[PDB]
Amino acid sequence: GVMDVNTALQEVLKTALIHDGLARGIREAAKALDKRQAHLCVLASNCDEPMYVKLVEALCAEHQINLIKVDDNKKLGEWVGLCKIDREGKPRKVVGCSCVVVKDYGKESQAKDVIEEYFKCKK
Amino acid sequence: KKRKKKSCTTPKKNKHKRKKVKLAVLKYYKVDENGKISRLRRECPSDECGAGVFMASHFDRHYCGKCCLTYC
Numbered sequence: 001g002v003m004d005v006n007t008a009l010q011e012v013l014k015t016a017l018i019h020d021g022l023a024r025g026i027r028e029a030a031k032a033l034d035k036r037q038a039h040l041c042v043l044a045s046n047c048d049e050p051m052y053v054k055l056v057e058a059l060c061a062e063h064q065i066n067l068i069k070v071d072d073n074k075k076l077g078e079w080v081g082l083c084k085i086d087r088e089g090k091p092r093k094v095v096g097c098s099c100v101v102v103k104d105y106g107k108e109s110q111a112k113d114v115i116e117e118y119f120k121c122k123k
Numbered sequence: 124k125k126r127k128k129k130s131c132t133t134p135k136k137n138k139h140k141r142k143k144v145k146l147a148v149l150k151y152y153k154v155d156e157n158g159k160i161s162r163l164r165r166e167c168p169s170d171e172c173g174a175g176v177f178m179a180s181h182f183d184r185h186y187c188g189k190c191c192l193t194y195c
């Protein structure tokens with residue numbers, strides 16, 4: 001509870017990158033849900049297609065997947081690792097995706113308390 | 124100097140391009156506002172690509188991409 005929800009994606013996408021559990025993309029990210037093993041999805045409200053959100057909110061809800069609301073979709077390309085770093089630590093090449101799906105969690109508890117208390121409050 | 128440009132390069136042996144429509148999952152999915160998942164194409168019954176990986180629906184057959192299974 002010491003960390004905010006809008007920054008709660010950061011450390012969990014870092015600790016799950018070491019196990020290759022981040023579905024960059026949209027089609028293969030949605031097909032990970034049809035493997036019935038993914039655990040969370042993030043929708044960026046800065047969107048481009050009205051057809052795009054109404055399918056993914058229909059897929060994640062009926063198969064019991066919650067949601068993390070972050071605004072911008074070029075912003076989500078950083079923590080998935082889809083952006084190339086510069087020499088001193090800046091994303092010199094910005095490539096941002098609008099759908100991020102995790103499959104397996106990292107081995108920690110600094111995010112595994114805050115994502116759980118964000119989960120249980122909307123039940 | 125000491126060469127000629129010769130203009131004799133003929134690479135005109137055209138390859139393909141991957142024509143993808145914008146988010147082909149909309150070609151794959153169709154959902155009404157009540158929440159129905161209407162998979163418009165067949166699902167392959169193979170062990171490797173079962174229940175998540177969708178087939179093709181051609182003019183006369185079904186067709187896979189992983190194991191290239193075919194029907195009529």
Ligand SMILES: [Zn+2]
Binds near residue numbers: 172173
């Ligand atoms: Zn397959």
